[PDB]
Design a protein around this ligand. Sequence first.
Ligand SMILES: [Mg+2]
Ligand SMILES: [Mg+2]
Ligand SMILES: [Mg+2]
Lengths: 233, 68, 100, 57, 118
Amino acid sequence: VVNPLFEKRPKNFGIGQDIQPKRDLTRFVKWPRYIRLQRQRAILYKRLKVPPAINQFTQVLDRQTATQLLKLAHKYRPETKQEKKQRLLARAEKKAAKRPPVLRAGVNTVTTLVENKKAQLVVIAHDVDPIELVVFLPALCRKMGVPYCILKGKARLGRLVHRKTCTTVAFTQVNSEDKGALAKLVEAIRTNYNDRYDEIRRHWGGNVLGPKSVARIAKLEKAKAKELATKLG
Amino acid sequence: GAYKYIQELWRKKQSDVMRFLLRVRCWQYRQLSALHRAPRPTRPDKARRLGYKAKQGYVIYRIRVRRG
Amino acid sequence: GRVIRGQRKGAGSVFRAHVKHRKGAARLRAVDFAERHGYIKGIVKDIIHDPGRGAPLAKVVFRDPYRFKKRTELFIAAEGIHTGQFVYCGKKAQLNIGNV
Amino acid sequence: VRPKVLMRLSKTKKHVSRAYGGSMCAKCVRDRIKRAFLIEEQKIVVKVLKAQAQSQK
Amino acid sequence: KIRTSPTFRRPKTLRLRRQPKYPRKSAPRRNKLDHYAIIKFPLTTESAMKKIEDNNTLVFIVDVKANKHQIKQAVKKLYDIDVAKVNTLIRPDGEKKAYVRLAPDYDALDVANKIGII
RNA sequence: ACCCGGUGAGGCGGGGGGGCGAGCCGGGCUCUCGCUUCUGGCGCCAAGCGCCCGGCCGGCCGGGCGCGACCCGCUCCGGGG
RNA sequence: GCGCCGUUCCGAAGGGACGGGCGAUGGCCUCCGUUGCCCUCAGCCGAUCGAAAGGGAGUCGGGUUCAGAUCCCCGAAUCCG
Ligand SMILES: [Mg+2]
Ligand SMILES: [Mg+2]
Ligand SMILES: [Mg+2]
């Protein structure tokens, strides 16, 4: 049935026996300078002693709470440029013949209404490129007694609004329909952050070496542990 | 607002957070070229004091000077 | 008074080396998988005399294990190597003259 | 002849009708054939000796 | 996608052609090297007349910016005659002397009497 | 952080898989190895296996993916610091 | 600071070509070129200048002028596309 001329011809990929195939070589790419910069920058963020004012952005509110917070923030999204023209056209037709509460974006408006004590929940993006914009705001919400949460990605927070990026979002006023779920989110965010902000202040960052050096130190420590075990017996 | 907090946060440079930020920024800018474009300011508050606004045609160049 | 001869030698443009008739730089093979773990074989094509050098050099033809192309190297020919000789190179190579 | 002249010459004028035609002399060609046969036969002998070593061991 | 080569060259991005909204200049420049401007005058030298009478040619004086194909098409257009070949030289006066060898079907003496030179 | 060397930055570190040695009662455990040395030969653009679907009439013609060619990683490997 | 160093050195340094798929055109829309996109392939070495004695394909004879002749005329070829 089968053709006996079909010879199996394996290549012996030994050292100097045959040519080597074009395997995966993503680790050994001579990357460009900007990629090589942005990788070892995050490596230095893993290595160096991160202060707690920057380490507070490393703890992110989890996925099951973040989805409910996005579901709550989708109801109170601000106006569109076309919706503004539609409301102006409706106002013009009303002139020819109470505003709903919306979001308050931007660190300026957010901090002014937090010192005015109007916020009930303050959403923070963890990944701002100048970090000094938002360092003071968690401790400021701690002092004012305002619940603050920190989420991954400023793009997903800036696509709630009709923009690109957004650092801080305030929940000033909500309707009677969206009160109980807002209180259940405020309670979880408060017990996550405001009850345990002192441990966030005590928690330092970094001091984590690379995997090769950790493996070498662990190899020497396990060797010395096996030695000090086998002398006692 | 937030700009006064950002202002004295850039003032208090001898603290641990700010020494860490100056060290990481000086490292990153030393790996960067001698003359390039920063599309957004590193000090937005100091830029707004000097007269920078957020509109089209206002560009910021990050350059280095050899010290001494 | 004038600029002395040892100072004039450091500037250049007269006292530079005569590197026209020289064949190339007598450099060994770079470190890789074959130099690190096992070994790789290469023939001695011909031994040539390099100008400005007492040592004769050797055109050693290696086979590249990654791409199909025969490489050449300018080895420093030690005393005892003849042409048509298989110079091995690597960690698992044997200890004899004409082997690194 | 000079090398750019070789566009004018025909195909048979530039090489010889043989394996390694116009590149290698026939003595080194037949020596290379002898070597390419005998190293392969030596590899066959080494494979038979390895099979016998695995048969005993 | 696996990385075959260890080098990372620049990826072949897309670029577009020139589709301008308005041209740079308003009008295209007219041909200032016309056929009438590229031929100044034929010579009335005794040696030039001997060359015409013997070797079936015509001797012209040409602007220095010309080509042999330009002189050939200019003689073919402004004399209604076929050209065998054109031999050019630049005189020490400055202009280009052109020996236009004609085809033997027409006569150089006849076309010289036709254009007036003698 | 900073400095030097090599590369066309080509297999770096751990965890797997297999064989060769020692001791204990088929089993785990400490270590080494990973295919090339009698010869001036040749060696690339996959063989083999499995899963698919496209067209034509169990058969015909043209393609893709994974094994072969282990997995996870955070600095290209080293040398100073 | 006019600019200087540096020629492979702290570079994302290619616009190239084989084959396949898709649409748009052109010509007895047969069959093929032309461009547009995608898949796929690729090492090079430094942009550029630098010898009228270096390397460098291919022309010789006779005749002609007051001055030009491997150039003009005649007869023979020859190189490249
Ligand atoms: Mg001087
Ligand atoms: Mg030149
Ligand atoms: Mg020359």
